[PDB]
Design a protein around this nucleic acid. Sequence first.
RNA 1: UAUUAAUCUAGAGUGUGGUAGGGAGUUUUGGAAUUUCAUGUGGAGCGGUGAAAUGCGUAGAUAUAUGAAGGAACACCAGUGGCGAAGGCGAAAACUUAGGCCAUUACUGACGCUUAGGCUUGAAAGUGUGGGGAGCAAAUAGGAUUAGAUACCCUAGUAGUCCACACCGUAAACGAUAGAUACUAGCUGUCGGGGCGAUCCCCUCGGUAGUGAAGUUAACACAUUAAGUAUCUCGCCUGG
RNA 2: CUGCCGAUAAGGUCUUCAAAA
Lengths: 85, 71, 141, 59, 184, 85
Amino acid sequence: QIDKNGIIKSAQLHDKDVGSIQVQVSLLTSQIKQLTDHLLANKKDFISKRGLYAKVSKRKRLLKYLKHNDLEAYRNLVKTLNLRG
Amino acid sequence: FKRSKKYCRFCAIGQLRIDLIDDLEALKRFLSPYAKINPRRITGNCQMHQRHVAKALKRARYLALVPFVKD
Amino acid sequence: ITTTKPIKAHFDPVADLLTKINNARKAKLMTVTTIASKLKIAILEILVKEGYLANFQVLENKSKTKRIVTFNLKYTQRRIPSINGVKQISKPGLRIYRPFEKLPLVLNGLGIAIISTSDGVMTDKVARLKKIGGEILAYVW
Amino acid sequence: PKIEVKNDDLELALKKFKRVSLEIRRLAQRHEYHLRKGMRLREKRKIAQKKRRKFRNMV
Amino acid sequence: MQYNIILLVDGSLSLEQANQVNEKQQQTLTNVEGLQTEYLGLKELAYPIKKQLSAHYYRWKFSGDNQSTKDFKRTANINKQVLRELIINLEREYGYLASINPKKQQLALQKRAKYDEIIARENNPENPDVPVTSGLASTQPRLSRTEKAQKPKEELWDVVQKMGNFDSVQANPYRPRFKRFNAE
Amino acid sequence: PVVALCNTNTNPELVDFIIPANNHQPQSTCLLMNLLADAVAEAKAMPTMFAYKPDEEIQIEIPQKKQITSQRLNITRNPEVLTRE
RNA sequence: UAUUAAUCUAGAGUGUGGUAGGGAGUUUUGGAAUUUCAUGUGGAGCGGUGAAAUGCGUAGAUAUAUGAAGGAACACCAGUGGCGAAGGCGAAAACUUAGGCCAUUACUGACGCUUAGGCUUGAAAGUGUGGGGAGCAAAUAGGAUUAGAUACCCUAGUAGUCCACACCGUAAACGAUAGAUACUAGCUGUCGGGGCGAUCCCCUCGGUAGUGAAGUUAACACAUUAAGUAUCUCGCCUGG
RNA sequence: CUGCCGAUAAGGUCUUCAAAA
Ligand SMILES: [Mg+2]
Ligand SMILES: [Mg+2]
Ligand SMILES: [Mg+2]
Ligand SMILES: [Mg+2]
Ligand SMILES: [Mg+2]
Ligand SMILES: [Mg+2]
Ligand SMILES: [Mg+2]
Ligand SMILES: [Mg+2]
Ligand SMILES: [Mg+2]
Ligand SMILES: [Zn+2]
């Protein structure tokens, strides 16, 4: 499993901000990376595919939400995370 | 006649954990005379424990500690 | 005043109250609670002036971030309610806007129709008196 | 399924052997016929319900 | 993690087997914590496996990374001196999180103490234990619960406006309808 | 008009003049039943038995055949309606 | 109501702290039982049925004792049960991994429900390539029964049932009941977390059942897990 | 305690009525 503690501390805008959108997408990208590895290795586990698709769809909606409100921070998050492409 | 003393031991003691080399003589009581996991009416544990002991005894029965079909 | 239970409400503010009143009437219950919004408060104020409920009190927390209105129904001595039936007009989706010429009369004036034209919610009779119409929330008779 | 005779009497051995064989015969006859898995669960569920309801009234 | 192997070595000679266990331990286990070992003894196992009726049971309570299992697992079978081997990763057995919680542990100690008290009176030295109360029900409820009972998070709210309130109170239901009998 | 001694398991609508009371105690029933009978006797102009009376005359006995037990048991005589197939 | 400029946490999520699971995939391991073969003892039937006959058997069968090989499925535990969105999941272990329940003085601050089109999964049978094949058995052969039997019974018996990779995308895929939200008597069970501390039992928050009034229904019946009082969205119906 | 056991031409009545005693 991923060391969730280290990744969140990097993405914090300020301390105790353990529930923003930026920290959520950073955590989500790590789980996606791990799950893509696991699913590519196995290729017959479909519940993990369900989890991967659900997490991918959830990530898309939250970043889309962050585009309607405070679009500038969306620009900041995308260049660091490199999630678009 | 019968008895109402069919009551899970591990609850009164709060053992909380089953290991085959901590209550080995205890697990032989749950087993039948023909090396079978007695049902609830005879064995007496609550379903939660009954599942935990079953996994441990079958694990013991895989590690070759208790017979299969004979005494 | 204190409670013990969580207070929830539906997203649609007219039918949320409508279900509460109708269910309380049907279940012979008297005191019910829900979250407070300005439209629901206003419809209840004109409602209590016309005499369908006895008391209607809106309350707020000690932090000033939430308000919940806890109202009771006006039962007579024999325990049969004063409300007989409730039906909503301005349903979600289909917003009902009617000019004065097609302003409804509920049960030949026996019931009351709630119409929020321009000065908040307002009864049908005074709407006819002012000769001005608009949004029609619900029928109560 | 060994049961000792105890060499004190014979009948007692058959009084226990009747019980042991009946529970033995149940599974011996069960693994004689193939039912689909759904049907196999039905007979398992059927026997449990019969035994349960019967056990309620003697307790 | 914390692992636990129950190794099955053949029944040859004691001293040379212990050496076999040390050899089986030091070859594999790439990364490991402290490897405490015991020796349950000599028992005649139930079903003969590998045509052997006696075996030495060793238990290892080491700890380390997930790689400590693979080499040992593939080497156990090849070694003719080992009959069986079980890597019971104790972090997944039926109940571990409750065992680490300290509060639950002290309760188990208290339950042990109290239960031992009951069993003693029943199996009294010679005097008859008339109650024989064990499986049966207990006495009245525990006053501990009655007091230390939880209290709902009573969110306190403050009144702001009012109108018409009069608390008439009409709690006189199912009252008599007829009043005084009369003749036409 | 019908009067009754309801005992918590009655539909209050059917009775008119409800008289909250017991029905399982061979003592409570007699005291209350005689009380209604006592009104009838006073209306008919013959002396009362229990009503408007002091302590010494109300004593009544508990029929034969610690404290009296008004507990409802014998639940085992209510199995599931014969079913199954 | 819609638009825009902002504030708040109760909706919905996240973290910390408790926590139950046959949830899934990959790789290894185990014992009974059947079949075949090997070695002894043994001596005339075995097998099958409503009754029999094909069939197997002096080339020593059935049976009994030991051993070897191989494939398939995982008794008891196992339930007036658990998990998953559904199909489904039950010998043991390791690795990887999904969701869920309870308490939150924490955080973001409406980020939520539904979903045409699209994508993913989807019992069994069936297909293509390569392995595997103990047992069973569509097609097929024979013996019975029968007025006839291409069927029900019996003896044999290929594909198939199994694995890996590719398709097929249908089922009474059923709770014959789309999802989400708020409210509406009660009683009896059972499961999980939390509070107390022998259990047992009591309370709180949830899941799964039975009974049951108002209410609904053409009736059967549903009835806090609604087919009840209402809202949103999608799918679908218009005589045979 | 489970052998065997198949078929049955077409169309058709019959409620007159309560006004009432
Ligand atoms: Mg063999
Ligand atoms: Mg298939
Ligand atoms: Mg033929
Ligand atoms: Mg055959
Ligand atoms: Mg084929
Ligand atoms: Mg279909
Ligand atoms: Mg019902
Ligand atoms: Mg047509
Ligand atoms: Mg015949
Ligand atoms: Zn228990």
